[PDB]
């Protein structure tokens, strides 16, 4: 089920299998941490012990980009396909948009997650995005942000802070966040906000 | 020819067109800066004025990943391209042409392992030198001099965005290469 790319475990999953695993996570009443490691993240983890530890403690590590798939070719069972973290997020949203799954968007500059919300509502009619908040917050602002996420009863939280900040923030707040899925999505809100 | 994605100019090119442009850059006696902007880079450039300036002064910006292509759907980029595949496809073509390549970046012996693996993958490839990326100021002088003395034409900079673009741009008048391109974690995955 998993392969090791320089200490980083990667779930041997296709896009469809990753979406199915995320849907199954919604049936388990606990926080699930999802990361999408790519070649850049593997490189970063070699120099960042804390990041390497987090990546070894997530519920699902979906491969992102081409580089990580190429690295897996050394194995008898390589990674089955090239997956983009961006496409995984959209495909997962698409499926839950008709199920009433409460989504929270946290990250990017002022009004970017609001614009992303407006655009996702047009793209996926019926999507339930319960709240949004910018990603250039201090540690002081953090507790009020987590309280709003929890008060709105969010089931899925997309964290557009960029790697490794997004994984580190989720992991540090793993016992505070009352969501079922927390997933780092990097620049995904910016490109949907157009 | 170029699309603006939140201030970042993106060359409206397919992978093959990008490879053809890079081949043509080898015929021009000047440094060409190549970046592969993705959604993450676009986001970084909104808060980093110096990075935004560099991305507006590169010779070629090839789209990387799905997010940036999705953003272009407003009016689009012809295809989803990975910067990693662009690097390999460009190496593949120049491996039989004697084009000198320098590998700079990544931890300890990763760049040298990447060199060994590229020599197996593309027989005839001319990688004249390698160096790790966690270098000091005194080491930069030695690296730049090695790059120029060995006569490298193509430089792959595996330092990660924005460090890779910033390092190339700061040293744009020191580097005697025809192409300098940031490649992120590309050496690690070839090693």
Automatic annotation (TrEMBL), chain A:
The keyword Glycosyltransferase applies. UDP-N-acetyl-alpha-D-glucosamine binds at residues 36, 108, 135-136, 163, 166, 187, 190. Its EC number is 2.4.1.187. It is an enzyme of class 2 (transferase). This is N-acetylglucosaminyldiphosphoundecaprenol N-acetyl-beta-D-mannosaminyltransferase. GO terms for molecular function: N-acetylglucosaminyldiphosphoundecaprenol N-acetyl-beta-D-mannosaminyltransferase activity; nucleotide binding. Catalyzes the conversion of GlcNAc-PP-undecaprenol into ManNAc-GlcNAc-PP-undecaprenol, the first committed lipid intermediate in the de novo synthesis of teichoic acid. UDP binds at residues 108, 135-136, 163, 187, 190-191. The keyword Acetylation does not apply. One of its GO terms (biological process) is cell wall organization. The chain holds residues 2 to 195 of 244 of the full protein. It comes from the Bacteria. Pathway: Cell wall biogenesis; teichoic acid biosynthesis. It catalyses: UDP-N-acetyl-alpha-D-mannosamine + N-acetyl-alpha-D-glucosaminyl-di-trans,octa-cis-undecaprenyl diphosphate = N-acetyl-beta-D-mannosaminyl-(1->4)-N-acetyl-alpha-D-glucosaminyl di-trans,octa-cis-undecaprenyl diphosphate + UDP + H(+). Belongs to the glycosyltransferase 26 family. TagA/TarA subfamily. Keywords: Cell wall biogenesis/degradation, Glycosyltransferase, Nucleotide-binding, Teichoic acid biosynthesis, Transferase.
């Amino acid at each position: 089920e998993r392969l090791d790319i320089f200490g980083v475990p990667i779930d041997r999953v296709t896009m469809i299998q990753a979406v199915d695993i995320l849907n199954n996570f919604l049936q388990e009443n606990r926080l699930h941490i999802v990361a999408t490691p790519n070649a850049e993240i593997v490189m970063m983890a070699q120099k960042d012990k804390e990041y390497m530890e987090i990546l070894n403690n997530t519920d699902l590590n979906v491969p992102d980009g081409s580089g990580i798939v190429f690295a897996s070719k050394v194995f008898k069972k390589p990674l089955p396909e090239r997956v983009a973290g961006f496409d995984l997020m959209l495909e997962f949203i698409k499926g839950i948009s008709s199920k009433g799954v409460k989504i929270y968007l946290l990250g990017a500059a002022a009004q970017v997650a609001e614009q992303a919300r407006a655009n996702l509502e047009k793209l996926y009619p019926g999507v339930k995005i319960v709240g949004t908040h910018h990603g250039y917050f201090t540690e002081e602002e953090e507790n009020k942000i987590i309280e709003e996420i929890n008060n709105k009863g969010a089931e899925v939280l997309f964290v557009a802070l960029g790697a490794p900040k997004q994984e580190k923030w989720i992991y540090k707040n793993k016992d505070k966040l009352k969501v079922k899925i927390a997933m780092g999505v990097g620049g995904s809100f910016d490109v949907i906000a157009g």
